[PDB]
């Protein structure tokens, strides 16, 4: 068995080469493009011998072994050099701990449109690989498969814009959009990795159950659970640097989903017709399916049933998972974090009540405890959207700027405040029912990015406390801070 050969066969040469490039660039963030090209070509040429013959020398070695050896060969020739002196699995772990989100790299200075377009024409392959490298090294936790989709979007932008009247008018703006989308996507991918990386699956899986249940309300719990399992695998591998395995697994998941649309969602047809990278991206951004017609209240199964405590005790995670699935499928208007706070509240009540002589009497009005929790984000959005609507984006940003600076580096405060002003502009324009999911979910990203930035240089204490305390309670912690 040759893993490299299997991955090459499944991914195809072009995708294999791009993924190897991203993988190296995300670790050797400091190395020149040409260094990475050499490495990729060498790896690819070797992979081909394995494809031709799985019994060829070294073909049976693990991807981590082969990758580390390739990287490490370069390194012997600061701290990065130390990882190279370690053996697998310590070596991979070491490299993973050394993916620094921001050891600072100078912002990208784009050539002039005429120069770019000409370079695009002269050598599309190298030109596109160059960009792949630039993005990857600047964003080490950027979800690999997604980077491949962005690359095809960049290729489309150059294809269309380089044969337009005003190169810049067409191209420069698209590039700006892609850059912005890219940074956003990378921030989301860091949030997911941070949960997996520290806490492990249960935190990620909880988030996944809630999100998938809102998205696929008609799907059965077992189906949602299966999808969370598959997604956890993809995400785990990508997060730890198992890029090829992750990419192939994502392709396999999209395929599974498309072959089981009738058991998942009625909104997947359009995506399942798309090309392999475009299909997975579409599925990932698919709008929520309409929820089933007459859904009963959760009261019967989660409050009235005699088996509440029995079902909880037997398999707590299963029971809580079911609660989260039932509540989420019924509430696409809630943020995922709100749903997680409701499940945590339910968990704490059951853990307390089930120990009582008469559990039912104890947890009989649990749903009442939910009301204040739901209202807090709801009112916070109302007041802020109303303030935004009266101030405008700029003045709004400045009000947030002063508010947060008063509570707790100026460049960071400016950037975050600007982005927060945009949340307002983006989300407040949406109907009340859709405001929470977009606001709270995007804010959780912006705050995680702020946490990361504080993490590299911990000068403040209040922020670290809120950042590492509870992921679900990050915003309320932070939001509730005083001057």
């Amino acid at each position: 068995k040759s893993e490299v050969a299997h991955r090459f066969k499944d991914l195809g040469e072009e995708n294999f080469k791009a993924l190897v490039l991203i993988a190296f660039a995300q670790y050797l963030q400091q190395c020149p493009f040409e260094d990475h090209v050499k490495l990729v070509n060498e790896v690819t040429e070797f992979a081909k011998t394995c494809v031709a013959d799985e019994s060829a020398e070294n073909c049976d070695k693990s991807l981590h072994t082969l990758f580390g050896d390739k990287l490490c060969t370069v390194a012997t020739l600061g701290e990065m050099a130390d990882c190279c002196a370690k053996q697998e699995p310590e070596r991979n772990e070491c490299f993973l701990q050394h993916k620094d989100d921001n050891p600072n790299l100078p912002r990208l200075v784009r050539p002039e449109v005429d120069v770019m377009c000409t370079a695009f024409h002269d050598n599309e392959e190298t030109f596109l690989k160059k960009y792949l490298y630039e993005i990857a090294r600047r964003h080490p936790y950027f979800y690999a498969p997604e980077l491949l989709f962005f690359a095809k979007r960049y290729k489309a932008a150059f294809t269309e814009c380089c044969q337009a009247a005003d190169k810049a008018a067409c191209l420069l703006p698209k590039l700006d959009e892609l850059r912005d989308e890219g940074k956003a996507s990378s921030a989301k991918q860091r949030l997911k990795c941070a949960s997996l990386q520290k806490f492990g699956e249960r935190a990620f899986k909880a988030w996944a159950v809630a999100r998938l249940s809102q998205r696929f309300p008609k799907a059965e719990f077992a189906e949602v659970s299966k999808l969370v399992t598959d997604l956890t695998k993809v995400h785990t591998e990508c997060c730890h640097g198992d890029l090829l395995e992750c990419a192939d697994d994502r392709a396999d998941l999209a395929k599974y989903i498309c072959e089981n649309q009738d058991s998942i969602s009625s909104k997947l047809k359009e995506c399942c017709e798309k090309p392999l990278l475009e299909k997975s991206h579409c599925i990932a951004e698919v709008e929520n399916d309409e929820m089933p017609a007459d859904l009963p209240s959760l009261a019967a199964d989660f409050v009235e049933s005699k088996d509440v405590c029995k079902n909880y005790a037997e398999a707590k995670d299963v029971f809580l998972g079911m609660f989260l699935y039932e509540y989420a499928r019924r509430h696409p208007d809630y943020s995922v974090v709100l749903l997680l706070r409701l499940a945590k509240t339910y968990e704490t009540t059951l853990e307390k009540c089930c120990a009582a002589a008469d559990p039912h009497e104890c947890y009989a009005k649990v749903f009442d405890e939910f009301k204040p929790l739901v209202e807090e984000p709801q009112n916070l959005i109302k007041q802020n959207c109303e303030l935004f609507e009266q101030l405008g984006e700029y003045k709004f940003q400045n009000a947030l700027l002063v508010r947060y600076t008063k509570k707790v580096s100026t460049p960071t405060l400016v950037e975050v405040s600007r982005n927060l002003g945009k949340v307002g502009s983006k989300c407040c324009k949406h109907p009340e029912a859709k405001r929470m999911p977009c606001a709270e979910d995007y804010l959780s990203v912006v705050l995680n990015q702020l946490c990361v930035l504080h993490e590299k240089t911990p000068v403040s204490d209040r922020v670290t406390k809120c950042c590492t305390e509870s992921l679900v309670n990050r915003r309320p912690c932070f939001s509730a801070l005083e001057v």
Binding site: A222, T229, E259, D317
Partner: protein, 104 residues
């Protein structure tokens, strides 16, 4: 963590039986629930199987093994059979399937 389903192909004649044997492997977690599904020939939807009458499930949580036996085999049965296992952590996985063909 994986679920191994055997046999992946089967052909029986009318009036016979079929036993599909599934195993939850590569996990440290216990087996909680089991699920059996039927995907009709030329179908884009799998419906869950209510274990009754001809359908007989045999569970062994220690071996983490579960099997389904179909008593009387008819042409109508010709379909793809999928087994799903759920661990106590909710890790949910599917066996690779069984393509059974019933002939007369």
């Amino acid at each position: 963590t994986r679920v191994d389903q055997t046999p992946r192909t089967a052909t029986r004649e009318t009036g016979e039986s079929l036993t599909i044997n599934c195993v939850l492997t590569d996990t440290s977690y216990p087996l909680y629930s089991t699920y059996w599904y039927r995907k009709n020939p030329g179908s884009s939807n799998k419906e869950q199987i209510s274990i009754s009458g001809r359908y007989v499930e045999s569970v062994n949580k220690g071996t983490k093994s579960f099997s389904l036996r179909i008593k009387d085999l008819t042409v109508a049965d010709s379909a793809t059979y999928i087994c799903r296992a759920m661990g106590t952590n909710i890790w949910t996985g599917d066996g690779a399937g069984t393509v059974l063909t019933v002939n007369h």
